[PDB]
Design a protein around this ligand. Sequence first.
Ligand SMILES: O=C(O)[C@@H]1CCCNC1
Ligand SMILES: [Cl-]
Lengths: 118, 529, 107
Amino acid sequence: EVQLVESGGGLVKPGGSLKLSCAASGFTFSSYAMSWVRQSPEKRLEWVAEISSGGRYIYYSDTVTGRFTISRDNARNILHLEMSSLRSEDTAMYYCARGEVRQRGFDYWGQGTTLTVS
Amino acid sequence: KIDFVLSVAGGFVGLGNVWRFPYLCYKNGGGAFLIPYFIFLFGSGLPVFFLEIIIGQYTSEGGITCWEKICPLFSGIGYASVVIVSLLNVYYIVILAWATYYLFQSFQKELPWAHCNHSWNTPHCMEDTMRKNTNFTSPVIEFWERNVLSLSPGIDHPGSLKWDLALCLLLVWLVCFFCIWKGVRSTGKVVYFTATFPFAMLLVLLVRGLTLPGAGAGIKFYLYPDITRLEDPQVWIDAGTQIFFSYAICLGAMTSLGSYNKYHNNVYRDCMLLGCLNSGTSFVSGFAIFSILGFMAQEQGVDIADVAESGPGLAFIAYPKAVTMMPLPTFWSILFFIMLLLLGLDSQFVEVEGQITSLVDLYPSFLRKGYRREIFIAFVCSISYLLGLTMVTEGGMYVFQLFDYYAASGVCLLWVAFFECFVIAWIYGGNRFSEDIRDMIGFPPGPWMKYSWAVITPVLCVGCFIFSLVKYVPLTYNKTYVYPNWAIGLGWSLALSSMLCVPLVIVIRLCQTEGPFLVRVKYLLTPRE
Amino acid sequence: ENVLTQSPAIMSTSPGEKVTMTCRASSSVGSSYLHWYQQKSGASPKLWIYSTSNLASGVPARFSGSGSGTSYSLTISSVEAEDAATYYCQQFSGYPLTFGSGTKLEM
Ligand SMILES: O=C(O)[C@@H]1CCCNC1
Ligand SMILES: [Cl-]
C-alpha cells in the first residue's frame, strides 16, 4: 500500500473514445476493490464507477453507465477505464481510488490525469 | 442491540445448552471436555455459523435452493440438512414430553421424588441425608428411572407403551401444530417475558447451586482437566458435536435466510454476539449442574463421577434435587419446568417451520397450490409423532440415546460441515466468497474466517473422524450398559441416512449431465447465475 | 442518487480558533457508511475521517467527527495554517456514490 499512478490522459475531440490507466504497486491488487473518482474543473468531486476485487461485480454512475466501461488486470496490477463517447461535461481530472472496505472509504488516491475535450 | 437478541437468540438458546451440554461434560469427565469444546468453538463454530448466515442471505432461501447457485454438484448438502432436521425433530420433543410429564407430576403438595415411600420405589432406596448416617439408591434417580421412564432392562425388550408419556407427547405436538398452522410467533410484547424468564430461572438455580455445601468439589471437577482423557476421541467428538449442535451448524441456513435477512445490520458483530451469548449460557449452566452434582456427592459419600446417570437424564436427576432443596419445592419445580418447556418450544417451532418451508420448497407446485399448506403440516406432525412413539416405551430410553448420539450428532455433523467448508473454500473459491461477502455486507471476512474455512475446520473434521475410526469404542448407555450389534447398526444407519446424501446426489447429477465425464464435472462444478 | 450537500461552502477563519462544518444528505445514511476526505490546494484528496468517528492514520487527534441520520459534521479544535484545505463528505451506503459540494477554509 504505497503507490498509485494514473496515465493515459490527453486531448481529444468531443464524442471520441479514450482509455485511461491506473498502475498500482506495494499491495495485492487482486484482493482490493478499485474505484474511479472524477474531479470536475469546478473542483466538484463525482463518482464514476467501481470494480470489485475479482471484477465480477461492477457499478456505474447514472451519468456514465451507458458510455463508460471499467476493467482490471490482476496479472499486471493495472486498472483500466475505457470510455466510448465523451460528452462536453466529461472533461475533468480522473483519480483511481482503493475502495475495498465500504465502511472505511477510499484509503489511497493516485496522482491523477487530466482529460480535455474540445 | 437487544432487538437482535430478542429476535434471534430464542431459536438457538434451548435445551441443547441447559440439558445436552451438562450431560456431555459429565460423561467425558468434566474438565477434559472444555479444552476441545473451546478449541472447536474458536476454530469452526463462529466461522461456520457466519458462513451459514452468509449462505442464507446470499440466496434469500434455505438449503433447498442456495446450493444451486454455489455448486450444483454438491447440492446434496441441502437434502442432508433437511433429513438431519427431520431426525432431530423426532427426538428433540421427547425432552419436552418428559418436562410436561414432570410438570404434571409436580401438581402435588409434596414432590414425588423427595421421598421414597411410594409403591414404584425399590427396597434399596435410602434417604440422601440418612444414607450417610451398601448398594443404596437415591429416590431422585430411581424415580426418574421407574416412574417417568419405566426403564426396560435392555433395548431388546421394548416392553409396553407408556400411555401418560404418549398423551404428554400428544399435548406438546398439538401445541406445536396449532402454533405452526396459526402462524403464532413471539412477535408480541410477551417476547420480553418469554426471553427473560429462562435466564432468571437459570440465575436462581445457579445461586441455589453455589450455596449448597460441597459445591467446591463440583466446580473443581468441572474445571480441573485430565490430559490423558483428551486422548479419548470420544471427548473430541462430543465437544465438536456439541459445538455444531448448539449453534445449529448445518441447520442454520434454512432459517437464517429469513430471520437474518434484515438490511443495514452488522452480520459479523451479530454472529459474534450470538456466539458469545450461547457459549456463555452453556458454560454458566455447567456451573449450576456441577454444583448440584458436587453437593450430591458430598451428601451421599460417593465419588462425583458416580453420583448420577452419565446420559440424557443428568438434568432430570440434578435439577429436581435443587428444586427439592428450595423453600416451597413445588413452586420452584413448576417454574423450572415451565422454563424448560418455553426454551424447548421456541426452538422446536423454529426447526419445524424451517423443515416445512424447505419441504414445500422441494414441491411448490403441489403443496403451495392452496389449502395443502395445513394438511402438509398436519401430516408432518403425525409422522413425527408416530416416529417418536417408539421412544416413549419402556425401552424407549435406549432408542432416545441412540438417536441423540447418531441421528443428529456424531460423524454426520462433521461430515456435512467439512464438505460445506471444503466446497466453499476451494471449489467455489475463497476469493469469490470473500468478494460476495464484500458486496453483501460491505467488508471482506478477513483472515480469521478465511483461514478457518480453508484449513482449520476441514483439518479438525478429518482429524476427529480418523481418530474416531482408529480408536473406535462401542457406544454405551450409562456407564455399564453395552449396546447390541443390531442397535449399533441401526444408529449407523441413522447416521448414514444423512451421510450418504452427498455422494448419492453427486452421482445422480453426474448421470444427469450429457457429454463426456470431464464435461459433466466441468458443467456441475461451475456456479449458476 | 442520494445528493449530499454541505452548507458552508466558504469558511473565513482566524488561526487558532475552532471551526465546525456540517454535511447534509437527501436521504438517511448509515453512521458507518459516511467518510470525509481532505484535499490540499493543487493536490490529490486523502482520507480524513471514516465511520464518522474514526480518525485516519495521517491526521492527528486535532480533528474530530460526529453525526447521525441525515445530518453529519466535523469539528476542529484549533485550526492552523496547515489545516487550510478543501473537505468533502461522501456516502458509501448505496450506489451511485455521491460526494458533497465541499468546504474550503479561506484562511
Ligand atoms: O437447542 C439447541 O441448543 C439447538 C438450537 C437450534 C435447534 N437445534 C437445537
Ligand atoms: Cl454449547
